[PDB]
Paper text:
Unexpectedly, S1P alone has no effect on Hb-O2 binding affinity. In both the binary deoxyHbA-S1P and ternary deoxyHbA-S1P-2,3-BPG complexes, S1P was observed bound in the central water cavity, with the phosphate and the amide moieties located in a pocket formed by α1Lys99, α1His103, β1Asn108, β1Tyr35 and β1Gln131, while the flexible aliphatic long chain snaked toward the β-cleft making hydrophobic interactions with α1 Phe36, α1Ser35, β1Lys132, β1Gln131, β1Ala135, β1Val1 and β1His2. However, while the ternary complex showed S1P bound in a symmetry-related fashion, the binding of S1P in the binary deoxyHbA-S1P complex was very weak, and only one S1P binding site could be unambiguously fitted in the complex (α1β1 site). Note that the same concentration of S1P was used during crystallization of both the binary and ternary complexes. Each S1P-associated interaction in the central water cavity was essentially intramolecular in nature (i.e. make interactions with only α1β1 or α2β2) and suggest that central-water cavity bound S1P might not contribute significantly to the stabilization of the T-state structure. Interestingly, besides the central water cavity bound S1P we also found two additional S1P molecules bound in a symmetry-related fashion at the surface of the deoxyHbA-S1P-2,3-BPG complex but not in the deoxyHbA-S1P complex, indicating that 2,3-BPG binding most likely is required for S1P binding at the surface of the protein. Since in the absence of 2,3-BPG, we observed weak binding of S1P at the water cavity and no apparent effect on the protein’s allosteric activity, it is possible that the central water cavity S1P binding is non-specific. Consistently, the dimer interface β2 F helix/β2FG corner at the switch region show some significant positional differences, with that of deoxyHbA-S1P-BPG further removed from the R-state.
Sickle cell disease (SCD) is a prevalent life-threatening hemoglobinopathy characterized by a point mutation in the β-chain of hemoglobin. Indeed, S1P-conjugated beads successfully pulled down HbA and HbS from normal and SCD patients erythrocyte lysates, while sphingosine or lysophosphatidic acid beads cannot, indicating that S1P directly and specifically binds to both human HbA and HbS in erythrocyte lysates. P50 of purified HbA or HbS in the presence of 2,3-BPG along with S1P revealed that S1P decreased HbA and HbS-O2 binding affinity in a dose-dependent manner. Thus, we provide biochemical and functional evidence that S1P binds directly to Hb but requires co-binding of 2,3-BPG to decrease O2 binding affinity, presumably by further stabilizing deoxyHb and increasing its T-state character.
Numbering used by the authors:
A (entry chain D), D (entry chain B): 1 to 146
B (entry chain C), C (entry chain A): 1 to 141
């Protein structure tokens, strides 16, 4: 990871304005609306037949929280994303069997949600920093696969 | 393959962009060059400074074709053919980048269209941009 | 898009596979699971050890599907009708993967058909496998 | 995804039976045949209008050689490829303006060549190792871009 003091600060100050539970569910849902094949991992979640069925699925919103929650504690360890997501990486591989490509997809969905919520504030230079972040996390969650 | 609902969402979200096409076109490019450095290797002859006349100028042209792809969304392959020939025989831009610019376009539209950039529209806009890209690389080999 | 030449290079190369289909098939897979471990996340139910009975069988299916695709290269879409639905609506493999299997398919064919693997023929197999990889994913969304 | 001792001492042994000159020219060659657009960086190489014209093209053969040369010299810094190519990455980015994907594609063509030459000798286990190699080389070469 290569974040300069500047983009590090930017990434924290904007995330201090962020509602983690409302966005975790905003991002997990869009991820399942835009790239439908991802529902492959959520058969037990119920009805996912329409955009509103997905966005409003209580199980989807309940999960997006623990997801962006972990991703949120990860931002306090931007110098150690590898070990931070060490245990989560092992689980998504050995037990959940989740193609890592998906973490890459959630990362872009998130970025789209950040820009959407903060509007103009999510300037070009701010996006650049975040892209680095999601790339970092996605790669730390993929690290332990074998 | 876009659907009736897709085309509705697209014409809807893009139609709103209206006279800000050029401007938004330049922003996506500025977002892409900063977020994905490697993409600048295709513009060695460009002044990439914030608001360069080149970027602003290339921004309009981009958005203009998209604005045009929208008007013939049921015949894009023919509406973008001159542009597709271009990217295949001259610029020869590697395919992997289109997805990069497409993301930045979504991101740009997300910042400007807070009311219309709904999950549904977002999804549809992703299929549109992906559909356009596929057309621009349709004659690569 | 496949030219009359690409089709000719294909029928020729693959037709030279004969009964080695199930064999090269299993092989293309084994290669893919070793080179690209993440592809193993779609077979938690398969034995992925060398000589696995499931890999062999699966190896054969994948092969016969290609044979069929070749025999109907002119109109692959309808030829792979069911198969696309399968991956689109059930298997749901991320499109990123198809490129891996394909590459492994080329490597495999190269190390098994040295003669006919000329640059041209190589170039034709590539476009081919991508054409297939596109049909299979055409109905994803 | 670093190489295991057994993989390093496998890459070596196989490479020792490689004709860098021919394979470099065969690899860069096929690269301009299978992915036409990569010919954008070689407008002055002359005739490339066909598969035989490019494969038999002297300037292509030559460059294919030089290129694999640097690569070949690389298989010795397998623990710091990132450091070996810092000046070449810094270079391919600043002056030549080459999109790093090409490093990925070439590597792709390379694996097919190495397979084409050794045949049954080019084992799935060996391919895997080389994939790592090629993948590694691609990364370092891109690392210094900005
Ligand atoms: C920012 C990236 C992500 C983070 C931080 C993350 C985090 C988590 C956490 C903390 C758990 C629960 C641990 C447990 O059940 O013991 C989990 C489970 C899971 N994750 Fe991820 N994940 C991420 C992305 C994804 C993506 C994009 C998918 C799928 C497309 C996915 C699919 C799953 C599934 C299937 C479960 C199991 C849920 C259940 O049934 O309880 N995750 N993830
Ligand atoms: C939304 C997808 C894209 C569209 C609609 C598109 C459209 C265009 C248009 C209309 C032009 C102007 C051509 C003319 O003046 O007739 C152009 C030029 C160009 N495009 Fe594309 N393009 C797309 C994606 C890409 C990507 C991904 C890259 C780079 C990573 C790229 C690189 C270029 C370059 C280098 C030029 C030359 C511009 C100049 O020299 O001023 N294009 N494109
Ligand atoms: C070259 C493109 C591909 C072809 C030609 C292909 C072909 C097939 C065929 C013929 C079947 C048999 C369905 C039946 O029994 O009726 C199948 C099953 C399957 N495919 Fe695909 N496939 C392709 C790529 C992929 C990729 C990229 C992956 C994974 C990385 C994948 C994962 C699966 C899985 C897991 C099954 C289920 C097998 C089972 O349950 O036993 N496929 N595919
Ligand atoms: C295996 C990875 C590669 C390595 C290690 C590499 C190495 C080299 C080396 C040693 C040079 C000489 C630099 C100098 O003059 O000091 C060079 C030049 C160059 N490379 Fe790369 N390269 C690689 C892949 C590629 C690829 C795939 C392309 C794109 C098709 C490319 C395009 C160029 C161009 C156009 C030049 C300059 C040509 C000239 O001066 O006539 N390289 N490369
Ligand atoms: C760490 C690797 C995680 C897996 C991603 C797939 C790995 C390989 C590809 O990036 C390239 N070797 C070739 O892809 P291709 O040549 O098929 O485009």
């Amino acid at each position: 990871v290569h974040l300069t003091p500047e983009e590090k600060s930017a990434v924290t100050a904007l995330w201090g304005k962020v509602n983690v539970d409302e966005v975790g569910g905003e991002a997990l849902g869009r991820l399942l609306v835009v790239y439908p094949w991802t529902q492959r991992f959520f058969e037990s979640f119920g009805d996912l037949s329409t955009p509103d069925a997905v966005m409003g699925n209580p199980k989807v919103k309940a999960h997006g929280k623990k997801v962006l929650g972990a991703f949120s504690d990860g931002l306090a360890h931007l110098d150690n994303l590898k070990g931070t997501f060490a245990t989560l990486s092992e689980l998504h591989c050995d037990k959940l069997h989740v193609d890592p490509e998906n973490f890459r997809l959630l990362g872009n969905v998130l970025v789209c949600v950040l820009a959407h919520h903060f509007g103009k504030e999510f300037t070009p230079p701010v996006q650049a920093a975040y892209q680095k972040v999601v790339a970092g996390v996605a790669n730390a969650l993929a690290h332990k696969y074998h | 393959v876009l659907s009736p609902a897709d085309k509705t969402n697209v014409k809807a979200a893009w139609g709103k962009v209206g006279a800000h096409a050029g401007e938004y076109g330049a922003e996506a490019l500025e977002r892409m060059f900063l977020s994905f450095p490697t993409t600048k290797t295709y513009f060695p002859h460009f002044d990439l400074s914030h608001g360069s006349a080149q970027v602003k100028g290339h921004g309009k042209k981009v958005a203009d074709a998209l604005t045009n792809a929208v008007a013939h969304v049921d015949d894009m392959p023919n509406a973008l053919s001159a542009l597709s020939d271009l990217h295949a025989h001259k610029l020869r831009v590697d395919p992997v980048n289109f997805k990069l610019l497409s993301h930045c376009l979504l991101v740009t539209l997300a910042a400007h269209l807070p009311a219309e950039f709904t999950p549904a529209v977002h999804a549809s806009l992703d299929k549109f941009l992906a559909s356009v890209s596929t057309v621009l690389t349709s004659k690569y080999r």
